[model samples]
Target: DPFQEYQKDFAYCESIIKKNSKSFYLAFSQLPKRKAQSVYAVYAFCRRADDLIDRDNNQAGLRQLERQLLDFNEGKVPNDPVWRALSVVFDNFPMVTAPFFDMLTGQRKDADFKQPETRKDLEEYCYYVAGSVGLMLLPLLTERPADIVVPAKKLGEAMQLTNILRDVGEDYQMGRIYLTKEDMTRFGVATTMLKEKQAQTQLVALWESLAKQAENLYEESFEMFPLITEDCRQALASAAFIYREQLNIVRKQHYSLFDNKNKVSHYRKVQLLKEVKSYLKSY
Candidate 1:
């Protein structure tokens, strides 16, 4: 039997996502047919970029990644499935590769991070990394990404902020603190204090406050059912609600910071999925 390239490799991308994300995979599973496949390709490419810096800690590899993307942008092909899938999506969506390239910019910035001097810098990073992901997915769901740019960017920023709070301790281990230096100063917290005072009641409140801020952004910007394609709205909504609850998770269990990654249990996550499904029915 001869090995066929397309079917097997794209399935590989599905497995990659299944292993890596709970909310994303669950939500993605709901997207209609080819749109779901296209999203898998997009995610696989982003995941590839993330692995370069995050999993491998290879900052310079980002340059190579940029060159590869430029090559792909010009109709060149690569052996990697991630790239192969992108070739189709970029051509199929019939869009420029600016947002995809912008995501790589965010990845490289992460690879060689400097503490941001101000809040705007932090938010810009959020936009580049997570907000750009939002934009990338928009074309898959709707034809008019420009029309929904406002909400899309907000959703990305909201999820990124919640993620910033969720992963702060682990990211700190890498000597990269995500809180804005300005906010750290206002919070009167040295970066080390992020996990050190997890037992403190005030620390819990501090996290609660941060999560609340994200939750409100989610309410404002991430209420995306209207903006998404009717068929794909359910998938995107599942992702948004699941992430929004993480804001509530941080609010509720600020203690989890000291021990490990902020998480809702597997059981709770499945439970939340049901909640999200029911809500989507009314949506």
Candidate 2:
């Protein structure tokens, strides 16, 4: 059966997440082995969700996948190895199921909803899609610190904003635009302008503005990093440095994320690793 194959291929699935989730894996490396495994398991589940949405390419298939995600959260039949792995993580770690549910809800909303109109709308969308991830991971790191949620949510927002800015051209090609109408108007760039396939000066200026805002948000999120354990703090610092490095690349390319694509070069990654090692030494 397919389930049997999935069991056998679980190692491949785990490896895919480990390779693709570079930032996450780097952060998780500082954690205890058990804790790191839990984080990896959660990543594996998320990877499945992303594959289902991006690869399956149909609403019906996505809906089925969403149901499976829900089932995984609820501790019902954990047929899939990824789901089984996530269930164990959820059960052992301080993590909650609500954020996972919210993530699924965001995916469903993405599949069914139209474009956002304002920054507030975009914030809500970001909360569901990415901020919730920060919230979920926060508990694992902080053991439910009172003040962690706010910073976690801000980090998630920052990450989502970076993603939006980086993928602007690609998303536009796919008929998806995450930029709010308000921002578009403020920057003197219209949504229709994306279809022109040429980078206008106005568009470049708007992207720079948006990237700066995301950088500010990330800086704010860093304020809470010291609240966690030293090990987790170094891990977060490393991951944050990696993400910030990506943002720097976006700026260096002069908002031409499309031209360079949304990927960091191996040389840049190695440089960031050295920075991370240096940062860890200071702590």
TM-scores, each model vs. reference = 0.89, 0.86
Error of 2 at 283 (Å): 6.7
Tell me how many clashing residue pairs each candidate has: 0, 0
lDDT of 2 by residue, 134-195 (tens): 87777668755567788888888988888887777878877788888887888899776775
- For model 1 the TM-score comes to 0.89
| Candidate number achieving the greatest TM-score relative to the actual structure | 1
**Residue pairs in clash, model 2:** none
- Angstrom error of the Cα, residue 180, model 1: value is 1.4
lDDT of 1 by residue, 105-195 (tens): 8998887789877768878998999999988888888768888887888889888988887767767777877777776666566665765
* Residue ranges of candidate 1 with Cα displaced over 4 Å: 1-5, 197-206, 259-262, 281-283
TM-score of structure candidate 2: 0.86
Pull out the clashing pairs in model 1.
none
